[PDB]
C-alpha cells in the first residue's frame, strides 16, 4: 500500500525498489501569440527514476518531438512515463528488476499498473511523502543533459556521488532530499550555499561538491536554515 | 397461463413472484400461484418472517416442466421441485383451482414491466451462470458469491457471471495500453461481444439477470456485475447505435422498478455519475438520465 513516515526504513532494505517522478516529463513555456492569444511551447523533459538504496538514477530524457501532433499532452505524459518505466524494467536482467515501484504522484498509478500487467509480482505503490524530486532540474549537470538532447536518450547517474563510501543509504537519501527541498524552496540561495567557497569543486564524474564530512554538516545546517527562513518569508513568522 | 402449486405453507413467509409479493401466515391454507404468464422466465422468492437473513428463490420457465414448492423441514426452506407425472400434476392443481387456494399472478394489462426487465433473459443462459444441471430451474440467494469474487469459496454454489476486469491482460492490448484503458471499445466489441457473448442480446441478458438478482436477493456480486457491464458500454467510444438505444430502455425500466429505499445500497454513485456525465455515452442515455435525475437526484 501507500508509503509514508511509518514505513520509511523500508526504502533502505534489500528489496530492489524504484521511485518514479513524472513532474518534469511534460514541460512548457507559456507565451503570447502575435494575435494576443496564449500558446505553449514544450521543452525537453525527463523521467526521474531512482533506486534510493544505491543512488542509481535512470534519467530518461523526453525530447519535445514525442509531443508532435499529439493531443491532451498532460494525460499522454503519464502514459509515456509508464511506457518508458515498463521498457526500462523489461531491459533489466530479472535479478535487477524492482520488486516495488513507488510513484510520487497518485495519477501515475493506473498508467503504470496497466503498462506493468505483464509483471504481476511488481507492486505499484503511492506515497504520502511530499518528495522534492521536481527540483531535479536544479542540479546543473542534469538540467544540462536534458536541455542539450536532440533525441530520446537514457542517461545513468549516481545521485549520491561517492557518499555511500562514508554514510548509509538512509543518511544519503536524507541528505539528497534536504538538498532538493532547499533547491525547490529557494533555488538561488540553495545554489549560493553549495558553491560559495571556490575551493570546493565538483568532480567531473559527480553532481555535487566534494565536501568533507565536516563541511557537509555545515552545508546541511545552512540548508535547514534556508528552508526554515523561506518558511518565514513565506508565512511571516 | 401456468401454475406453481405448494404442498403447504408451514412457516410464515413473504413470497415474491417477479416484481410482486405477498405475506403468508404460518400454516395458512395457501397452495400456490396461478395465471403465470407464459413466454417469460419468472422468479419465485422467499423471505422468512423469523429470519429476514437469506432471501432466496428460483428462476424457472413453465414451458420447461411442471414445478411445485414444498417446505423441507430438515433444510429449513421452501424448495422447488419437478413432477414428471403430468396427468397427476394437472389433476392435483385443478383440485386447488376449484377450492380457490391459489393467488393469481396479478398482471395489469397495460403493464409491460416484467417483459421490459427480462427481454433478453433466457433460461438456458441462467443455467450456465447458475450450475446445477439436474434441475430445470435455478436457485439463487443473497449470500452466493461470483466466480470473480472467489478469485479475490464453494465453486458449486457460485454465480458464474462473465469476468470483467478493466486492468487485465484480456482488456488491454500490448502496445495500446493508454488507448484501450481510456476507450474500452476493443474490450466491449472484440473481446466480449464478438468473442464471449457472441451477440448483444446475450450481453443484455446477463446484465438484466445480474440486476434482478441484485434487486430481489440483495446479492452484492450481482450488483457489481450489473454496474461493470453498464460501465463497459458507457466507457466505449464506439458502440452500435442499436445497443445504446436498447441499453437506455433497459436501464430506464430497472431504475423505474428499483425500490426507492434500496437506492442507497443498490446504486453505485461513481459508476452512475461517470456514465451519465463523463463517459463517451454521457449524451446517449436520455431516458435513463431523465428518470435518474428526477428519482435519485441525491446520488448525483
Ligand atoms: C403432483 O405434483 C406434486 C407432487 C408432489 C407433491 C405435490 C405436488 C403438487 N403439484 O402440489
mmCIF file of N, CA, C and O in Angstrom, chain B residues 135-197:
data_model
loop_
_atom_site.group_PDB
_atom_site.id
_atom_site.type_symbol
_atom_site.label_atom_id
_atom_site.label_comp_id
_atom_site.label_asym_id
_atom_site.label_seq_id
_atom_site.Cartn_x
_atom_site.Cartn_y
_atom_site.Cartn_z
ATOM 1 N N UNK B 135 -31.477 -30.016 -12.419
ATOM 2 C CA UNK B 135 -32.743 -29.299 -12.307
ATOM 3 C C UNK B 135 -32.915 -28.336 -13.474
ATOM 4 O O UNK B 135 -31.940 -27.780 -13.987
ATOM 5 N N UNK B 136 -34.179 -28.140 -13.888
ATOM 6 C CA UNK B 136 -34.549 -27.198 -14.951
ATOM 7 C C UNK B 136 -34.730 -25.761 -14.471
ATOM 8 O O UNK B 136 -34.982 -24.860 -15.288
ATOM 9 N N UNK B 137 -34.703 -25.546 -13.171
ATOM 10 C CA UNK B 137 -34.879 -24.256 -12.527
ATOM 11 C C UNK B 137 -33.584 -23.977 -11.777
ATOM 12 O O UNK B 137 -32.804 -24.900 -11.525
ATOM 13 N N UNK B 138 -33.354 -22.712 -11.399
ATOM 14 C CA UNK B 138 -32.088 -22.324 -10.772
ATOM 15 C C UNK B 138 -32.267 -21.584 -9.455
ATOM 16 O O UNK B 138 -32.957 -20.570 -9.385
ATOM 17 N N UNK B 139 -31.602 -22.073 -8.406
ATOM 18 C CA UNK B 139 -31.640 -21.453 -7.088
ATOM 19 C C UNK B 139 -30.608 -20.336 -6.962
ATOM 20 O O UNK B 139 -29.454 -20.502 -7.356
ATOM 21 N N UNK B 140 -31.032 -19.202 -6.391
ATOM 22 C CA UNK B 140 -30.160 -18.064 -6.099
ATOM 23 C C UNK B 140 -30.531 -17.542 -4.709
ATOM 24 O O UNK B 140 -31.706 -17.568 -4.329
ATOM 25 N N UNK B 141 -29.526 -17.109 -3.927
ATOM 26 C CA UNK B 141 -29.804 -16.441 -2.662
ATOM 27 C C UNK B 141 -28.871 -15.250 -2.427
ATOM 28 O O UNK B 141 -27.989 -14.932 -3.238
ATOM 29 N N UNK B 142 -29.114 -14.572 -1.305
ATOM 30 C CA UNK B 142 -28.440 -13.317 -1.009
ATOM 31 C C UNK B 142 -26.926 -13.506 -0.858
ATOM 32 O O UNK B 142 -26.160 -12.605 -1.187
ATOM 33 N N UNK B 143 -26.481 -14.671 -0.356
ATOM 34 C CA UNK B 143 -25.079 -14.876 0.008
ATOM 35 C C UNK B 143 -24.201 -15.444 -1.098
ATOM 36 O O UNK B 143 -22.977 -15.414 -0.959
ATOM 37 N N UNK B 144 -24.758 -15.957 -2.193
ATOM 38 C CA UNK B 144 -23.918 -16.616 -3.184
ATOM 39 C C UNK B 144 -22.902 -15.641 -3.764
ATOM 40 O O UNK B 144 -23.229 -14.489 -4.086
ATOM 41 N N UNK B 145 -21.670 -16.107 -3.907
ATOM 42 C CA UNK B 145 -20.589 -15.290 -4.433
ATOM 43 C C UNK B 145 -20.393 -15.606 -5.901
ATOM 44 O O UNK B 145 -20.807 -16.655 -6.392
ATOM 45 N N UNK B 146 -19.757 -14.676 -6.602
ATOM 46 C CA UNK B 146 -19.496 -14.859 -8.015
ATOM 47 C C UNK B 146 -18.088 -15.424 -8.203
ATOM 48 O O UNK B 146 -17.229 -15.329 -7.316
ATOM 49 N N UNK B 147 -17.884 -16.046 -9.375
ATOM 50 C CA UNK B 147 -16.572 -16.573 -9.755
ATOM 51 C C UNK B 147 -15.488 -15.524 -9.554
ATOM 52 O O UNK B 147 -14.406 -15.824 -9.043
ATOM 53 N N UNK B 148 -15.761 -14.275 -9.940
ATOM 54 C CA UNK B 148 -14.742 -13.238 -9.801
ATOM 55 C C UNK B 148 -14.508 -12.897 -8.339
ATOM 56 O O UNK B 148 -13.368 -12.660 -7.924
ATOM 57 N N UNK B 149 -15.583 -12.839 -7.547
ATOM 58 C CA UNK B 149 -15.432 -12.627 -6.116
ATOM 59 C C UNK B 149 -14.553 -13.710 -5.495
ATOM 60 O O UNK B 149 -13.716 -13.418 -4.630
ATOM 61 N N UNK B 150 -14.714 -14.965 -5.943
ATOM 62 C CA UNK B 150 -13.936 -16.076 -5.401
ATOM 63 C C UNK B 150 -12.462 -16.004 -5.803
ATOM 64 O O UNK B 150 -11.624 -16.639 -5.154
ATOM 65 N N UNK B 151 -12.134 -15.265 -6.866
ATOM 66 C CA UNK B 151 -10.745 -15.067 -7.273
ATOM 67 C C UNK B 151 -10.049 -13.968 -6.476
ATOM 68 O O UNK B 151 -8.821 -13.850 -6.560
ATOM 69 N N UNK B 152 -10.792 -13.180 -5.700
ATOM 70 C CA UNK B 152 -10.228 -12.058 -4.956
ATOM 71 C C UNK B 152 -10.308 -12.305 -3.445
ATOM 72 O O UNK B 152 -10.877 -13.304 -2.994
ATOM 73 N N UNK B 153 -16.433 -19.705 -0.869
ATOM 74 C CA UNK B 153 -15.343 -20.226 -1.685
ATOM 75 C C UNK B 153 -15.736 -21.559 -2.316
ATOM 76 O O UNK B 153 -14.901 -22.235 -2.913
ATOM 77 N N UNK B 154 -17.008 -21.931 -2.180
ATOM 78 C CA UNK B 154 -17.504 -23.182 -2.756
ATOM 79 C C UNK B 154 -17.831 -22.977 -4.232
ATOM 80 O O UNK B 154 -18.713 -22.171 -4.551
ATOM 81 N N UNK B 155 -17.151 -23.670 -5.157
ATOM 82 C CA UNK B 155 -17.397 -23.400 -6.587
ATOM 83 C C UNK B 155 -18.759 -23.860 -7.090
ATOM 84 O O UNK B 155 -19.287 -23.256 -8.034
ATOM 85 N N UNK B 156 -19.334 -24.919 -6.512
ATOM 86 C CA UNK B 156 -20.615 -25.428 -6.992
ATOM 87 C C UNK B 156 -21.753 -24.451 -6.731
ATOM 88 O O UNK B 156 -22.769 -24.488 -7.438
ATOM 89 N N UNK B 157 -21.590 -23.580 -5.739
ATOM 90 C CA UNK B 157 -22.622 -22.653 -5.298
ATOM 91 C C UNK B 157 -22.336 -21.220 -5.747
ATOM 92 O O UNK B 157 -22.788 -20.270 -5.113
ATOM 93 N N UNK B 158 -21.580 -21.058 -6.832
ATOM 94 C CA UNK B 158 -21.162 -19.756 -7.329
ATOM 95 C C UNK B 158 -22.078 -19.264 -8.447
ATOM 96 O O UNK B 158 -22.747 -20.040 -9.129
ATOM 97 N N UNK B 159 -22.068 -17.947 -8.635
ATOM 98 C CA UNK B 159 -22.654 -17.299 -9.803
ATOM 99 C C UNK B 159 -21.544 -17.085 -10.833
ATOM 100 O O UNK B 159 -20.648 -16.253 -10.638
ATOM 101 N N UNK B 160 -21.594 -17.843 -11.923
ATOM 102 C CA UNK B 160 -20.561 -17.801 -12.966
ATOM 103 C C UNK B 160 -20.870 -16.731 -14.016
ATOM 104 O O UNK B 160 -21.042 -16.991 -15.207
ATOM 105 N N UNK B 161 -20.928 -15.495 -13.545
ATOM 106 C CA UNK B 161 -21.027 -14.371 -14.439
ATOM 107 C C UNK B 161 -19.721 -14.266 -15.232
ATOM 108 O O UNK B 161 -18.681 -14.776 -14.817
ATOM 109 N N UNK B 162 -19.792 -13.587 -16.357
ATOM 110 C CA UNK B 162 -18.609 -13.352 -17.174
ATOM 111 C C UNK B 162 -17.688 -12.385 -16.446
ATOM 112 O O UNK B 162 -18.107 -11.308 -16.041
ATOM 113 N N UNK B 163 -16.419 -12.761 -16.282
ATOM 114 C CA UNK B 163 -15.496 -11.887 -15.568
ATOM 115 C C UNK B 163 -15.156 -10.676 -16.428
ATOM 116 O O UNK B 163 -14.713 -10.804 -17.578
ATOM 117 N N UNK B 164 -15.347 -9.491 -15.858
ATOM 118 C CA UNK B 164 -14.966 -8.225 -16.475
ATOM 119 C C UNK B 164 -13.963 -7.537 -15.554
ATOM 120 O O UNK B 164 -14.207 -7.390 -14.356
ATOM 121 N N UNK B 165 -12.828 -7.116 -16.106
ATOM 122 C CA UNK B 165 -11.799 -6.503 -15.263
ATOM 123 C C UNK B 165 -11.017 -5.534 -16.146
ATOM 124 O O UNK B 165 -10.392 -5.952 -17.119
ATOM 125 N N UNK B 166 -11.131 -4.242 -15.854
ATOM 126 C CA UNK B 166 -10.632 -3.222 -16.764
ATOM 127 C C UNK B 166 -9.117 -3.127 -16.758
ATOM 128 O O UNK B 166 -8.550 -2.572 -17.696
ATOM 129 N N UNK B 167 -8.464 -3.666 -15.746
ATOM 130 C CA UNK B 167 -6.991 -3.665 -15.683
ATOM 131 C C UNK B 167 -6.551 -5.118 -15.737
ATOM 132 O O UNK B 167 -6.114 -5.692 -14.742
ATOM 133 N N UNK B 168 -6.702 -5.715 -16.912
ATOM 134 C CA UNK B 168 -6.428 -7.127 -17.108
ATOM 135 C C UNK B 168 -5.830 -7.284 -18.489
ATOM 136 O O UNK B 168 -6.108 -6.496 -19.396
ATOM 137 N N UNK B 169 -5.001 -8.311 -18.656
ATOM 138 C CA UNK B 169 -4.442 -8.512 -19.981
ATOM 139 C C UNK B 169 -5.539 -8.762 -21.005
ATOM 140 O O UNK B 169 -5.366 -8.443 -22.171
ATOM 141 N N UNK B 170 -6.674 -9.344 -20.607
ATOM 142 C CA UNK B 170 -7.751 -9.507 -21.588
ATOM 143 C C UNK B 170 -8.271 -8.163 -22.082
ATOM 144 O O UNK B 170 -8.684 -8.048 -23.242
ATOM 145 N N UNK B 171 -8.272 -7.147 -21.230
ATOM 146 C CA UNK B 171 -8.877 -5.864 -21.550
ATOM 147 C C UNK B 171 -7.959 -4.938 -22.329
ATOM 148 O O UNK B 171 -8.436 -3.939 -22.870
ATOM 149 N N UNK B 172 -6.658 -5.238 -22.376
ATOM 150 C CA UNK B 172 -5.645 -4.260 -22.739
ATOM 151 C C UNK B 172 -4.689 -4.928 -23.711
ATOM 152 O O UNK B 172 -3.984 -5.872 -23.325
ATOM 153 N N UNK B 173 -4.679 -4.456 -24.973
ATOM 154 C CA UNK B 173 -3.788 -4.981 -25.994
ATOM 155 C C UNK B 173 -2.372 -4.461 -25.779
ATOM 156 O O UNK B 173 -2.185 -3.248 -25.643
ATOM 157 N N UNK B 174 -1.367 -5.335 -25.763
ATOM 158 C CA UNK B 174 0.024 -4.864 -25.725
ATOM 159 C C UNK B 174 0.227 -3.755 -26.740
ATOM 160 O O UNK B 174 -0.160 -3.876 -27.903
ATOM 161 N N UNK B 175 0.799 -2.643 -26.288
ATOM 162 C CA UNK B 175 1.043 -1.520 -27.167
ATOM 163 C C UNK B 175 -0.103 -0.556 -27.351
ATOM 164 O O UNK B 175 0.105 0.512 -27.944
ATOM 165 N N UNK B 176 -1.314 -0.900 -26.900
ATOM 166 C CA UNK B 176 -2.438 0.030 -26.925
ATOM 167 C C UNK B 176 -2.898 0.343 -25.504
ATOM 168 O O UNK B 176 -4.083 0.597 -25.270
ATOM 169 N N UNK B 177 -1.968 0.318 -24.550
ATOM 170 C CA UNK B 177 -2.319 0.435 -23.138
ATOM 171 C C UNK B 177 -3.196 1.658 -22.874
ATOM 172 O O UNK B 177 -4.292 1.555 -22.304
ATOM 173 N N UNK B 178 -2.694 2.847 -23.203
ATOM 174 C CA UNK B 178 -3.478 4.038 -22.937
ATOM 175 C C UNK B 178 -4.759 4.008 -23.747
ATOM 176 O O UNK B 178 -5.843 4.334 -23.232
ATOM 177 N N UNK B 179 -4.651 3.619 -25.014
ATOM 178 C CA UNK B 179 -5.829 3.683 -25.868
ATOM 179 C C UNK B 179 -6.922 2.773 -25.326
ATOM 180 O O UNK B 179 -8.098 3.158 -25.252
ATOM 181 N N UNK B 180 -6.552 1.542 -24.972
ATOM 182 C CA UNK B 180 -7.564 0.576 -24.547
ATOM 183 C C UNK B 180 -8.092 0.878 -23.149
ATOM 184 O O UNK B 180 -9.239 0.539 -22.841
ATOM 185 N N UNK B 181 -7.300 1.504 -22.285
ATOM 186 C CA UNK B 181 -7.781 1.780 -20.940
ATOM 187 C C UNK B 181 -8.750 2.958 -20.942
ATOM 188 O O UNK B 181 -9.751 2.953 -20.210
ATOM 189 N N UNK B 182 -8.497 3.951 -21.784
ATOM 190 C CA UNK B 182 -9.307 5.156 -21.766
ATOM 191 C C UNK B 182 -10.534 5.044 -22.669
ATOM 192 O O UNK B 182 -11.499 5.784 -22.461
ATOM 193 N N UNK B 183 -10.509 4.127 -23.641
ATOM 194 C CA UNK B 183 -11.608 3.849 -24.575
ATOM 195 C C UNK B 183 -11.761 2.327 -24.644
ATOM 196 O O UNK B 183 -10.993 1.645 -25.324
ATOM 197 N N UNK B 184 -12.785 1.769 -23.996
ATOM 198 C CA UNK B 184 -12.857 0.320 -23.854
ATOM 199 C C UNK B 184 -13.510 -0.392 -25.046
ATOM 200 O O UNK B 184 -13.836 -1.571 -24.932
ATOM 201 N N UNK B 185 -13.605 0.250 -26.216
ATOM 202 C CA UNK B 185 -14.363 -0.339 -27.325
ATOM 203 C C UNK B 185 -13.802 -1.697 -27.752
ATOM 204 O O UNK B 185 -14.559 -2.603 -28.116
ATOM 205 N N UNK B 186 -12.471 -1.836 -27.740
ATOM 206 C CA UNK B 186 -11.835 -3.102 -28.089
ATOM 207 C C UNK B 186 -12.345 -4.215 -27.194
ATOM 208 O O UNK B 186 -12.739 -5.290 -27.667
ATOM 209 N N UNK B 187 -12.330 -3.973 -25.889
ATOM 210 C CA UNK B 187 -12.742 -4.958 -24.904
ATOM 211 C C UNK B 187 -14.242 -5.254 -25.049
ATOM 212 O O UNK B 187 -14.649 -6.414 -25.028
ATOM 213 N N UNK B 188 -15.056 -4.217 -25.223
ATOM 214 C CA UNK B 188 -16.503 -4.422 -25.404
ATOM 215 C C UNK B 188 -16.793 -5.204 -26.678
ATOM 216 O O UNK B 188 -17.449 -6.250 -26.649
ATOM 217 N N UNK B 189 -16.298 -4.700 -27.820
ATOM 218 C CA UNK B 189 -16.748 -5.163 -29.133
ATOM 219 C C UNK B 189 -16.036 -6.440 -29.561
ATOM 220 O O UNK B 189 -16.674 -7.395 -30.008
ATOM 221 N N UNK B 190 -14.708 -6.477 -29.434
ATOM 222 C CA UNK B 190 -13.963 -7.637 -29.920
ATOM 223 C C UNK B 190 -13.926 -8.749 -28.891
ATOM 224 O O UNK B 190 -14.284 -9.900 -29.191
ATOM 225 N N UNK B 191 -13.507 -8.425 -27.661
ATOM 226 C CA UNK B 191 -13.286 -9.442 -26.656
ATOM 227 C C UNK B 191 -14.620 -9.992 -26.146
ATOM 228 O O UNK B 191 -14.818 -11.209 -26.038
ATOM 229 N N UNK B 192 -15.522 -9.100 -25.757
ATOM 230 C CA UNK B 192 -16.740 -9.527 -25.068
ATOM 231 C C UNK B 192 -17.860 -9.857 -26.045
ATOM 232 O O UNK B 192 -18.403 -10.968 -26.013
ATOM 233 N N UNK B 193 -18.204 -8.930 -26.930
ATOM 234 C CA UNK B 193 -19.348 -9.136 -27.811
ATOM 235 C C UNK B 193 -19.044 -10.188 -28.879
ATOM 236 O O UNK B 193 -19.738 -11.200 -28.982
ATOM 237 N N UNK B 194 -17.999 -9.970 -29.679
ATOM 238 C CA UNK B 194 -17.665 -10.947 -30.713
ATOM 239 C C UNK B 194 -17.144 -12.243 -30.100
ATOM 240 O O UNK B 194 -17.571 -13.340 -30.482
ATOM 241 N N UNK B 195 -16.241 -12.136 -29.129
ATOM 242 C CA UNK B 195 -15.590 -13.285 -28.544
ATOM 243 C C UNK B 195 -16.359 -14.145 -27.561
ATOM 244 O O UNK B 195 -16.377 -15.371 -27.704
ATOM 245 N N UNK B 196 -16.961 -13.543 -26.545
ATOM 246 C CA UNK B 196 -17.503 -14.287 -25.424
ATOM 247 C C UNK B 196 -19.020 -14.391 -25.502
ATOM 248 O O UNK B 196 -19.574 -15.488 -25.446
ATOM 249 N N UNK B 197 -19.703 -13.253 -25.658
ATOM 250 C CA UNK B 197 -21.172 -13.246 -25.679
ATOM 251 C C UNK B 197 -21.761 -13.595 -27.038
ATOM 252 O O UNK B 197 -22.930 -14.015 -27.106
#
